[PDB]
Design a binder for these strands. Structure first.
Lengths: 239, 161, 176, 51, 149
RNA sequence: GGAAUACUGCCAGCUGGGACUGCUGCGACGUAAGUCAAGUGCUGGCUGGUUAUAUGCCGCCCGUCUUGAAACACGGACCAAGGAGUCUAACGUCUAUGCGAGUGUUUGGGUGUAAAACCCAUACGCGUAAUGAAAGUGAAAGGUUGGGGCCUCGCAAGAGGUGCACAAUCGACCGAUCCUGAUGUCUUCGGAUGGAUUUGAGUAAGAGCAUAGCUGUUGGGACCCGAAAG
RNA sequence: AAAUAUGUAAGAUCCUUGUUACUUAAUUGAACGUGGACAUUGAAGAGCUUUUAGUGGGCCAUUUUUGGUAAGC
């Protein structure tokens, strides 16, 4: 009876080995806090070169037509896609591409990356969808409530314990802040990061501010289509 | 919604623990296999279990001749034959090169020939005790499926066209 | 166990934890509405006077008051009003205990007890008014506007209240 | 062979965690460090106008 | 919808040729002949079947040859030989190469091959009275095919 | 250049507060004693149905016939009871289960309690290779790949060897044909070699038979009834 | 033509070494086959088999029609 009881003590060691990891995470988190500062500032930093360059730019532009010469900004931006519209009155067609994005039901969500090819595939999907870039923060709010667990386990959520100790992650650090930074930057194997577990299952919008007309496009004045600003507003409502 | 999801649910599983067991021994023996498989490493013991659970279509008769050439004839130098179904007697070559043979059931003649040759005829329970890890083992074999009671059925069977 | 299907067998006493979070109401709720807690007083009506401990809200307004009467006794309320303003004693209830049971000295102790808070009250009533004070007591609701003054103050007053509440009970069986 | 493997269990049961601060100690490390750390925060914005 | 006549399919396994079609053999002529008189049977068993049995069953008297290789009439070994007209021999089991199987057995053959004497390890391939056809037993008695009450 | 804010973040969480809950690997105050999250007390007592109203299903029912049933389509006044996949053959499977390259036993005899039963001689088939009008003839080797597996390993990966189920791919053989036909005998003609072919067979494409409960199929009335009929 | 369109709509290993073949001048070549060694945005939507059943009478809309004046054709 004594000898297995000594085996139970060892469990106190396992109690240490992860905690040694906890300490590693605290450091990782401190470095990645400066990585957070960069994600926020980068968008702001782009704008500075235009601002620095041009006095000219603004006045001419409000008052009249024409454009001035010298510079121009390119932009990337990753996307989030939510299916507003149901299955009723549609071909299987477009449905099989939904199944491809992994929008299985209404109020399903999948993140997508920055490229022309996705967009073109997204065009067949289009009257399924509201889409756009949610900002750095709204995505943080998005993971916490809607995220789920991986295969080799069932659904187990994105909740606090489960991400820090668990979640597989071959490429890089799974931990809550690290994972979220890394998808948004859309660097190496962040497309493998965006092989989430699998769909975010969104609440219906509160107040129906998330529902402007299903009928309409952002150009008609509805919900449909690409819209950065509106998607962050929309996701907040999905809470 | 749906699909892949609906399709998976639409399938099935998988095995199945065999319909009826007339033998009491077979009912516990299969259960013993899932038991051994799960506490340790053994993949074979988990595999054998499924096959014992399926009926005429999974359970393989293997002949002495089929053992005699295949694992036996100085190939690997005398492993453990896991015959899921039963052995059948059919061979004379003034056989066999040893061996410790494992099966659910043997014919009398098969037990007799095998012990004289070497090893022990071992109905599989004795094998499981001594070998448990399941190394130095081959899971040998099918058929099963081959040609005499396949989709060669129903009249004057059942060629190409 | 064993075999053979499968009935029980019993248990408990567990949990768990809270602690900073224990606390947060526990003074407090008082903070939103003002006032002390119970025991609360007739200032008004009559000048010199009186005590009661607020056993109940049936809801707020409809409030239960008590003291003693095993035999012949003394009275008792459910009332939506008639007369009561707060003092400076506070417990860790608001106002829940109850029946109308007491008994051993209760009326009398509560009577000696009042004198002090009431005697503290009447100068502050002269300092503000008296005739006016009735209209406040009549309300009952209450509470926000002005929770003041002093009185001086507690230890014994708590003791009666704590007892009254404990007293309010009874077990022991009976037919009458 | 066996004593090399184990037992038992399980156990999810609830998960619905957030903001706390106590569950907001668990979901984080960083966000706690960062939590002091924020805004973005300084300076300069004026040139950009002035130009 | 049924009676059972609706459906049933069709009443009898016909209409299978006519309109319907699939399976079995259909549409016959084709051979007929031999009749019910000059007919069956000739019994045929592979030499492997005696060959297996060569060790149990068996120490079978002499001559020259060994310990296990034994002379055996195949006629005494085959069941339902007595209603059969004649008993015919085939050829061996399995073992590497284009393949032998060792016995130097052999007797009592009512027909044997040119691929049954030759791949059998050299033998005294001996034929029966019945086999030869050129057998004369004009009157008198013997050889006489084996009968049993 | 000081001049709100649109659209936007965080943490700082102040603060009012409804409705539904009740052994694991940790993160946080504390050198110390240890403790904080994850995975409620105090009083007064001790529901299903059935008669009738509000609101909604309802556009009965149930069926069926139908593309569409409330149907102004069809059937039934009401209720109790009766009232529809039966038996086995034969062919094909499924499923177990016993002996297994053969298995199988009518019926006798002996014995037998109630018929039953049992021992045995063992009445008699689809397998044990095939082709085909029939004469007549008659064989077992070999890989290539994925992947189940062992070992040699290194070990939370993995390859190279070595053995192969299985399936796909290839050749090769045994009969049938179709064509040269040796050795030759030399009236006669029996038959090695070798190839092409389509089909059928054999090896790594090797195995049942028996009864069982069940499904289908044909049948016999054949799930039941309904017609004028001959 | 050029269609412009738009749905479609099929389609996404290499080397060396030896040995064998091959169709085509006792002639020129490849390409076959082997044997051996070398070196290389998605996610269960999914392969095969036995047996089984209800048809083997449809309807409406949307788009593109074809006949019909049209039609709950």
């Amino acid at each position: 009876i004594l000898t297995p009881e000594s085996q139970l003590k060892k469990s106190k060691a396992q109690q240490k080995t992860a905690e040694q990891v906890a300490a590693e995470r605290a450091a990782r988190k401190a470095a990645n806090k400066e990585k957070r500062a960069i994600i926020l500032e980068r968008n702001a930093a782009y704008q500075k070169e235009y601002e620095t360059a041009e006095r000219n730019i603004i006045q001419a532009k409000r008052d009249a037509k024409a454009a001035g010469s010298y510079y121009v900004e390119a932009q990337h931006k990753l996307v989030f896609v939510v299916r507003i519209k149901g299955i009723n009155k549609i071909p299987p067609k477009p449905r099989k591409v939904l199944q491809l994005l992994r929008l299985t039901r209404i109020n399903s969500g999948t993140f997508v990356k920055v490229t022309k090819a996705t967009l073109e595939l997204l065009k067949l999907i289009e009257p399924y969808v509201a889409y756009g870039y949610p900002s750095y923060s709204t995505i943080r709010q998005l993971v916490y409530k809607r995220g789920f667990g991986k295969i080799n386990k069932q659904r187990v959520p994105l909740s606090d314990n489960a991400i820090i100790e668990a979640n597989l992650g071959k490429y890089g650090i799974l931990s809550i802040d690290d994972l979220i930074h890394e998808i948004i930057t859309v660097g190496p194997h962040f497309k493998q990061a965006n092989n989430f577990l699998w769909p975010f299952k969104l609440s219906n919008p509160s107040g129906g501010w998330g529902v402007p007309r299903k009928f309409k496009h952002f150009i008609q004045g509805g919900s449909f289509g690409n819209r950065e600003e509106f998607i962050n507003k929309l996701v907040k409502s999905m809470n | 919604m749906g699909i892949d999801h609906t399709s998976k649910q639409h399938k099935r599983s998988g095995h199945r623990t065999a319909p009826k067991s007339d033998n009491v021994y077979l009912k516990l023996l299969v259960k013993l296999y899932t038991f051994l498989a799960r506490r340790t490493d053994a993949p074979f013991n988990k595999v054998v279990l499924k096959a014992l659970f399926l009926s005429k279509i999974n359970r393989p008769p293997v002949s002495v001749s089929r053992i005699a050439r295949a694992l036996k004839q100085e190939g690997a130098a005398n492993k453990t034959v896991v015959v899921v179904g039963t052995v059948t007697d059919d061979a004379r070559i003034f056989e066999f090169p040893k061996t410790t043979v494992a099966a659910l059931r043997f014919t009398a003649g098969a037990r007799a020939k095998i012990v004289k040759a070497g090893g022990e005829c071992i109905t599989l329970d004795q094998l499981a005790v001594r070998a448990p890890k399941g190394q130095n083992t081959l899971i040998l074999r099918g058929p099963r499926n081959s040609r005499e009671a396949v989709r060669h059925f129903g009249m004057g069977p059942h060629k190409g066209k | 166990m064993s075999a053979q299907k499968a009935p029980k067998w019993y248990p408990s006493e567990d949990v768990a934890a809270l602690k900073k979070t224990r606390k947060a109401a526990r003074p407090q709720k008082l903070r939103a509405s003002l006032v002390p807690g119970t025991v609360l007083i007739l200032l008004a009506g009559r000048f010199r006077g009186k005590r009661v401990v607020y056993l109940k809200h049936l809801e707020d307004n409809t409030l239960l008051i008590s003291g003693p009467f095993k035999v012949n006794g003394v009275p008792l309320r459910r009332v939506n009003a008639r007369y009561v303003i707060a003092t400076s004693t506070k417990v860790s209830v608001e106002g829940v205990n109850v029946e109308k049971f007491n008994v051993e000295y209760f009326a009398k102790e509560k009577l000696t007890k009042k004198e002090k808070k009431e005697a503290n009250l009447f100068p502050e009533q002269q300092n503000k008014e008296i005739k006016a004070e009735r209209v406040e007591d009549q309300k009952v609701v209450d509470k926000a506007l002005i929770a003041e003054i002093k009185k001086t103050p507690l230890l014994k007053q708590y003791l009666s209240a704590s007892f009254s509440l404990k007293n309010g009970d009874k077990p022991h069986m009976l037919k009458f | 062979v066996l004593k090399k493997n184990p037992l038992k269990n399980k156990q999810v049961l609830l998960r619905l965690n957030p903001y706390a601060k106590v569950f907001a100690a668990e979901k984080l490390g960083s966000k706690k460090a960062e939590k002091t750390g924020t805004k973005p925060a300084a300076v300069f914005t004026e040139t950009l106008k002035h130009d | 919808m049924p009676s059972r006549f609706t459906k049933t399919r069709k009443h009898r396994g016909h209409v299978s040729a006519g309109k319907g079609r699939i399976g079995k053999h259909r549409k016959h002529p084709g051979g007929r002949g031999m009749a019910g008189g000059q007919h069956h049977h000739r019994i045929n068993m592979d030499k492997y079947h005696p060959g297996y049995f060569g060790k149990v069953g068996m120490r079978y008297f002499h001559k020259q040859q060994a310990h296990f290789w034994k002379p055996v009439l195949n006629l005494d070994k085959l069941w339902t030989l007595i209603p059969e007209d004649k008993r015919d021999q085939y050829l061996k089991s399995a073992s590497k190469e284009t393949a032998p199987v060792i016995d130097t057995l052999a007797a009592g053959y009512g027909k044997i091959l040119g691929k049954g004497r030759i791949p059998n390890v050299p033998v005294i391939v001996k034929a029966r009275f019945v086999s030869k056809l050129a057998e004369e037993k004009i009157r008198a008695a013997g050889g006489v095919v084996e009968l049993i009450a």
